[PDB]
Each structure stands twice: as C-alpha cells, then as structure tokens.
Amino acid sequence: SSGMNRHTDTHYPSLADKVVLISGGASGIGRAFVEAFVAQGSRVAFLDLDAEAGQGLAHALGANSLFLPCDVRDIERLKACVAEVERTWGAVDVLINNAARDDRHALADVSVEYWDERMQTNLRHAFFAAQAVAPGMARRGSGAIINMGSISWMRGRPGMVCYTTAKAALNGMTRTLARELGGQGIRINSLVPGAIRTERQDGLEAASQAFIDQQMLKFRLDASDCARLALFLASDDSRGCTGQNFVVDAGLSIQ
Amino acid sequence: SSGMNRHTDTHYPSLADKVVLISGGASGIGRAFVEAFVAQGSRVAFLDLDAEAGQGLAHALGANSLFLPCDVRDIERLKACVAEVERTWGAVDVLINNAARDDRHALADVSVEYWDERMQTNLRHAFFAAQAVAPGMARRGSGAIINMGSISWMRGRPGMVCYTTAKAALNGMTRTLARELGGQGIRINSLVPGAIRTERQDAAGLEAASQAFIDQQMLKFRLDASDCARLALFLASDDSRGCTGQNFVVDAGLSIQ
Amino acid sequence: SSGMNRHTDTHYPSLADKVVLISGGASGIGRAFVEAFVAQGSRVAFLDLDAEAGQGLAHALGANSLFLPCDVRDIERLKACVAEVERTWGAVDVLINNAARDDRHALADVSVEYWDERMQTNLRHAFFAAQAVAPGMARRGSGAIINMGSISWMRGRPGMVCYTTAKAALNGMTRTLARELGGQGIRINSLVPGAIRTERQDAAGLEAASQAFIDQQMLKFRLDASDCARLALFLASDDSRGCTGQNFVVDAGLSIQ
Amino acid sequence: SSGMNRHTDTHYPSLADKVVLISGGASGIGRAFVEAFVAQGSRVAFLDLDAEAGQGLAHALGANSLFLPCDVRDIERLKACVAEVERTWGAVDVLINNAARDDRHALADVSVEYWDERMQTNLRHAFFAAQAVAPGMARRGSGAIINMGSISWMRGRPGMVCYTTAKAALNGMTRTLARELGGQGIRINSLVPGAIRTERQDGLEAASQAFIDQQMLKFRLDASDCARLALFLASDDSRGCTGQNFVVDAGLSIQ
Numbered sequence A, D: 001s002s003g004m005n006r007h008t009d010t011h012y013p014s015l016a017d018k019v020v021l022i023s024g025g026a027s028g029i030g031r032a033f034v035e036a037f038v039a040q041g042s043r044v045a046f047l048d049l050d051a052e053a054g055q056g057l058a059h060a061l062g063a064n065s066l067f068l069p070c071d072v073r074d075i076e077r078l079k080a081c082v083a084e085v086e087r088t089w090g091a092v093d094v095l096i097n098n099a100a101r102d103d104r105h106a107l108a109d110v111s112v113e114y115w116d117e118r119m120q121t122n123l124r125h126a127f128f129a130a131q132a133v134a135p136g137m138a139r140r141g142s143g144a145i146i147n148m149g150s151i152s153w154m155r156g157r158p159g160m161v162c163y164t165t166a167k168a169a170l171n172g173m174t175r176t177l178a179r180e181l182g183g184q185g186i187r188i189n190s191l192v193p194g195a196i197r198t199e200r201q202d203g204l205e206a207a208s209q210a211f212i213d214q215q216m217l218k219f220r221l222d223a224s225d226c227a228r229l230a231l232f233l234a235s236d237d238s239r240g241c242t243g244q245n246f247v248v249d250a251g252l253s254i255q
Numbered sequence B, C: 001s002s003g004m005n006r007h008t009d010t011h012y013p014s015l016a017d018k019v020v021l022i023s024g025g026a027s028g029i030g031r032a033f034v035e036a037f038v039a040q041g042s043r044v045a046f047l048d049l050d051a052e053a054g055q056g057l058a059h060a061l062g063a064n065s066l067f068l069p070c071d072v073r074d075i076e077r078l079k080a081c082v083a084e085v086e087r088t089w090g091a092v093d094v095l096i097n098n099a100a101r102d103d104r105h106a107l108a109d110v111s112v113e114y115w116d117e118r119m120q121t122n123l124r125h126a127f128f129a130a131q132a133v134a135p136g137m138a139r140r141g142s143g144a145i146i147n148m149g150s151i152s153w154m155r156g157r158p159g160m161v162c163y164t165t166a167k168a169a170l171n172g173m174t175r176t177l178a179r180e181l182g183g184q185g186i187r188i189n190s191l192v193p194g195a196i197r198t199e200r201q202d203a204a205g206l207e208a209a210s211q212a213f214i215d216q217q218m219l220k221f222r223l224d225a226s227d228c229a230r231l232a233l234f235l236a237s238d239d240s241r242g243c244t245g246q247n248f249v250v251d252a253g254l255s256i257q
C-alpha cells in the first residue's frame, strides 16, 4: 500500500519469501523494519505489547504481515509466538531483536525491581528469541539474527544505566552467539543506530540541532536509515558477515 | 602474616589507610586482591559466600581485614554489608566488583531461571554495590571502582553465554557509570584478565590446556592471580587518578589472535 | 560482457550513472569491484599498474568502464588520473582506495627504503586520492569514500609490519576524514575483509591453509572477492547514506577467536 | 634535585638501574617521563632535536640522565643514538617512542612533501627505534616498549590528518609487534593520553574549561598523569600486559 513507506528503492531478490520476525514491531524503528521487509516481499511476523497499534499496522500491510501480541517480559508467550510463526510459515530466516525500553532513570533511583524488569524488557528476550529460532535455522542450515545495539553505551551516555547496560550486553552476546551458532549456518550481527528521529522521541528543534552539530553528516537520521541497514544484514549480500557491529549514526559516536 | 603473598614489591603510599571493598574476596583472584591491598596498609573488607574460608583468611590477615558473609545475589545483604563497612571504617575508597560464576553451560539448554540467577550472580551486584558506595564517595569527593571484566566475550568464547554476556554488560556499565559519577570525583574502570591460573580454573589434561594458552598468548608464560592484583593496585592508587571509563587488559596477548 | 560476474542479484537504483573510481582495479578484489559496479550501471574508472590487464578488462566491460594506467606511488600521476576522470564524467561519486601490497616481510630485515615504499604503496595514495576527489564531491554536496582496511592488524598478525601498520593507519584516517569532510556531504567508511580467496592469495599446501581459515572462522566457508564487492555496493549506495566514520568487517568471524 | 618533579610518591623497585630510552625527551610529556624514571633510579637516555633544552634537562637530572641530540627524521642518527646507549649502559630495558609533531594542518593544504615529513617525524622512527632495541632485549630475554598513542584518531579529530593517521598506525604496530616480539620476552603496549596541559600547548582558560566540561573527571590532566602510567607500563607490575592500549584521558574519548 502506497501510503506505507517502502524505505528504499533497492531490490533484494534474496529477501523474497523469507520469514522475518521482529520484536517491538508496531512502532518507531520496529515498524519501519516491518514495512521495509514487507515491501521486499518477505513474510514478516512482528511482536508488540500494543495490540491496537499492532493490528492497525498488520491491517495496513496485508497478509504477508502477521501481528502477534506479546509482552517480551513473558518468555513463555515469547516462545509460543515463535512456535506459532514456525507453524504458519516454517523456520524463521531473519530475527530482529528490537524490543526495548529507553525510559530515562538516575543511578541513585534504580530499585532492584526496576533493574530486573528493565533487564527482562531490554536484554533477556533477545537471548531466548535467539534460542527459540536457532534449532529450526540449523535444520535448514542457514539463518540470520540482528541484535539492535546502541551507540549510547559506546559514548558512555549517563542517566539510563539499565538500557545502556543491556545494549552493551547484546554487543557481547552477538560475538559469542556468532561462534556458538556459526557452525550451523547462522550469522549474527548487531545493528547499532545513532540518534534516530521517530514519533516516540520527544525545544525538540533545539535538541535536533544539537544532534546535527555533533554528527559528522549534517542531517537527522530516521527509521528508514535503520531499515536500509537491516535489509542488507538480512539479505544474502551479507552472507559472509558475522559477529560484527554495523553502526548507522552519521558519526555521532565519534566525537 | 609473615607467610602471606604480598603480590608485588612496589609501594603505593597513596594506598595506605584506604578503605577497599572486594566481592568474592575469600578465594582465587579475590583473595589475591585482599592480600595485595592489605600488604599496602589498606583497610580491606571482603564479601564471600564461603564463611569458613572468609573467616580463616581474615584471621590470617589480621585487624586491617574484615570479612562479611554475603550472597551477592541477595541485594539486601549486599547493601547491609556496605553500610556495615561504612560504619566501621567510613566511606569506601576502592570498590572491586569481583564476585562471579563462570560455570560452563550450553546455549540450547539455558532455562529462564538459570539465566536470571547467572545474571544476578555475574552482573546485578556490580551495579548495586556501585550504587551503595557512591553517596559516601561523593561526600568525600573521591573514589575508585574496578569492575572485573573478561576477554571471553571479546574473543566470542562459546559455552557460557550468561557469563560472557554479563562480562560484556560490565564493559558498557563501566563507561556510563564513569560519566554518571565522574562529576562526583569517582573514577571507574574495568580490569580485564585473560586466562588466569587459579585453584578453581585448574580443577596432560590440565597440562595440555595450559600449554594451549601459552601457545595462543604472545608472552609465553601463564598468568596468575598476582598479575591481576598488581593491575588492581595501580587502578586503585593515585597513580591512575586521571584514568576512567576504560578497560585495562592483562592477558599476555590471548585476546589478539 | 555476457560472461561477466555480476557478484550479486541485488539491484541498487541509486548506483546507476554514479562515477566510481577504484585503485588496483585490474585484478583480484579491485577487479571484482569494477565488475560489480559496472553491473549496476555505474560509470567506473579504475587505476592499475598492469596496463595489459587493465586494458583487457576495460575492453571486456565496455564503454561504462575507463582504465587509467597509474603507479599509485606516483602522486602526480594519481592526481592526473583523477583530473582526467573528472573531465570525462564529472565529479567522482564513489572512491575506493583499494591498491595495496601485502608481500610478507620480516620485522628485523626492513630497511628505510623498503618501509617508505611500502607506506607509499599501502597508505599515502589513499590520502591523496581522497584529497583529489573531495573538492568536486563538495561542489555537488555529496560523495562516498571506501578505504580498504584489513583484520590483520586487529588480529596482530606478524610478518608484514608495513602492510598491517598502513592498514591500521587507514582505520584512523577513516574516522578523521569522516569528520573533516562530513560537513561537505562526504561519507567515509572502511571495508575490512578477512581472508579472501583470490588468484594472488592462492599463489595440501593451499588446501591446508584454506582449511585452517575455515576452522578458525565462525562460518565454515571461504570468502571470495564477491563477498567484498557486495559489501562495497552497499557502502556506495543511498542505502548507507547515514553511515560514516565506521568499519564494516566481512570476515566470517576470523577476527574474533 | 628537589626542583625537578618526581611525578609520583610510588616506589617501583623493579625500575632501579633499568635502561630507559625516550624520544622527544627534552620538553613536555617526554621531559616528564625523563624526570619520573630518573626519580625511580633508572638510567635514562633521551633524544631531542633541541640541544640547549636537552643539555639543560640532563644538567638538572645528573649523571643517571644522558642527553643525545637527534633528529628522529634521520634514521641513521637514530640507530647511532641507540647503539651509543647500548655501549654506555647495555641493552635498553624500556623504550618510549614519544617524539611527535602535532602542528595543525587542513586536509586540502597537505602537500606530498609535508605528508612525508610528518610521517617520518610522527611514525617511522617508532618502528626503527623498536627494531634497534629489539635484538639486545631478546638476548637478555626481556624488555618493554611503550608507543605514545593519542585519543585524537579515536575521536576522529579533524585538522591534523598526518598526526592522527600516524597515531592510528601506532595503534596497529603495537598489536603486531607484540606478537612478533612476545616470544622473545618483549612486551609492547601503547600509552594513550587525552588532553594534557603542557607548556607547549597554547582564551587558553576558555579552551581548558571546555576540556573539563567534556571530560568525565572534572580536572585538567598534566604530564605527571602520563608519567605515572608510563612507570607502571615499564615496571615488572605490568609484566603480563602486552598488545594493549592504556588510555589516560579523564574520559575525554568517551563522549
């Protein structure tokens, strides 16, 4: 549907028909992933807590989109969501661990409850999602995982320790998973965005200018920038790339 | 006390009388830290699950050593241990988040409970220990934190996802905490060992695996606990006052292959 | 032309008509770049020392290919090659600094002359080529530079100090040039291959060394020139418009061991 | 002499009597190295182009200091300086490749001559100095090399391409030299300072404040900070450390 952004004019034949699963798929960056892969003729499942946003997006994208309600905190539901995707469409080809919560929080204010919940929301699911997709990928002898990283921990960004720490954790999990699963044909990399303009983000003008001034390239990045990178990392054109970060940040991380 | 490993012949005057707190202090690398700082005239508190090992080591080291029993999974006890150190000796000067569990485990087999507990044992405590020491450090306007890292995740070592992932997490937490707390005078770095010969790590066979480390390393000798302790002393002293947010890798080149 | 490796089935509309300049273009990885961009409807100029290889390849590819003979050590010729490309086709859109010499050499034996020439062959040209393309890019307000990096220095590979040192130098030059030129619309990244099977790299024995790469890699297959070209196309296209200052490693995991 | 800074109160017994060689030793950071190691009872040789500054410093430090005039561009003189140190005191124990020129220069203005000279002044000597000291170290079965790095290339600092590029080059040379020479007992690491206040550096107040605001620790670093790190990297307390960077920058590189 021509009202939904295709994100790129590039055409990746290797993406047609591939089974893509994306967490936090109903808004922002995750929504853009969903749209971009749909536009490449992939069969795209997405998970999200927001049922009405989820169903509206699936309605807009049509029958090559599948919306599954899921609180990623709930690993049991997460593994059921995976099982359901497998039954419908077969083994996942591409997993994008995208779901995350970047609510700001001061070091001194974090309680044990808040820490644990933030870790469950930002880190734990990425591991279990990978664990769930892996055996089916291995049966086929191929598959691709993309962990959404962040330059925040790289730049040592203060004021959201749980989020930055989870993100840092994914940096390592990418490397060890790449080794653990590479022998099975599965490649795992991390897509690492800079400051991406989305609806959810936000004096807005002022903060946007500060990003431009800090960046090497003097324009704002958006969700399309992420999705273009994702398509490449999913396609057969990145077949030899594993264990690695790919940073799309207009230079924000190098200051 | 006359039989104790001092770990180095170096003397750091800035370490005398400093309050040092170390988790997993009763054996292996943690024990070496405790000995080394004691030998520099620091006041060293240490936490460990093993009460008998803890009390024997504190008895051997004497009155500038303080052993507090603590399961680091238990945040409430962790915070009580800190508060007790503070009441005894004042604000902590040096925190070393050392406690960890590197038991091997297969990716495919990890359950939700195993994951959570491994994360609590390897990661969570390091944040809360930091949070507990911070206010007292800030009141003074100075302090140092050392997070024990690992080259395992850097080398993408398989077969212990929870441990390597926690270690990678500490890599990030170092950087953000360094920024968040630096305005208060607190510096935070990660000490990142390679393959350290210890009693646990030990437990040809052993000989063969030890040779493979030497063959893979750039320097052809086995690193031990003392190598870690010497690095820790430097990172605690006034000679590293300006260093923060950073890794310091003591690995004889194992991570560069 | 009907017999030519296209390298990928992907189609990048943004690459059509773009002016692509590639050093060491006549063989191996450089030749693959030339073929791949030609297959996307780019206008591709390439530089190489080997005149007969160069002219045959341009003859095989046709009128959207332009071969300029060039010794990259000779900066004057390098700048003349650039100016000639500019006059033919306009401002370069994509520069790929690919020319290099990875001949093995012992640390202890390197002379002052060998060092200088190896640095001129492996490093110097990449800066001057960048400097030559920059003004034309800036006039348009857009452009992309790709510096061929190597995992060799990352893995601290011995036995070719000048090559690994040049490659490490490019790692830094990428970052500073990205900042220095980004205000003009120019993005700059490094494509960093692992162990690429080529005719030269080839020249059990071969079989045994090839197996050792597979055993050391995370993905159990040999990478080739096409793997590099596919990465290059992405880094040149509008799909990487926002990426700058960065490494992109295509190494099947060889650098993480 | 109590007019010359000792830089630290720490005492490293393993440094007593060790033969230390430092390039660009007569001013700024290099001078501080010379003073600090002298104060630890090392036998310290230093190289510098400035003969009067060199001789004044050697005069202040006494007979455990040795000043050799040397233009590091001249590799022949560099290798003679090394040979002379070896003859006087024996094999070098510690080499600090410090000599460098950080004159600012725009990308478009660099000529071929300027590039080559900057590379000879900033990079080439570090390799040849290492090559010269190595065989003597290997005979003994021990030695330590410290390459002065810089966070400038890490932070992608514009406006001095030759300097930042040389510095980046040393980052790699450290790793490969560590492997090449490790089997001989020689360790090689890079000491990587942030923005160090020296006499040569420099509205000065304003620029100094901007460094404090950018840094995680809110004080200015000085030459002493570098020397304290150098002593550790030279001593037996870092015996197991090789191939690595050690960054002393108050957090400036993580922004």
Ligand SMILES: O=S(=O)(O)C[C@H]1O[C@@H](O)[C@H](O)[C@@H](O)[C@@H]1O
Pocket (backbone or CB within 6 Å): B102, B149, B150, B151, B152, B155, B157, B193, B194, B195, B196, B201, B254
């Ligand atoms: O061999 S590495 O994993 O590269 C380095 C070492 O890291 C440690 O934290 C592990 O507990 C060791 O078992 C391991 O040997």
Ligand SMILES: O=S(=O)(O)C[C@H]1O[C@@H](O)[C@H](O)[C@@H](O)[C@@H]1O
Pocket (backbone or CB within 6 Å): C102, C149, C150, C151, C152, C155, C157, C193, C194, C195, C196, C201, C254
């Ligand atoms: O084996 S690595 O040195 O780690 C990767 C590869 O890097 C290339 O630039 C070298 O020219 C190859 O000869 C080498 O195989």
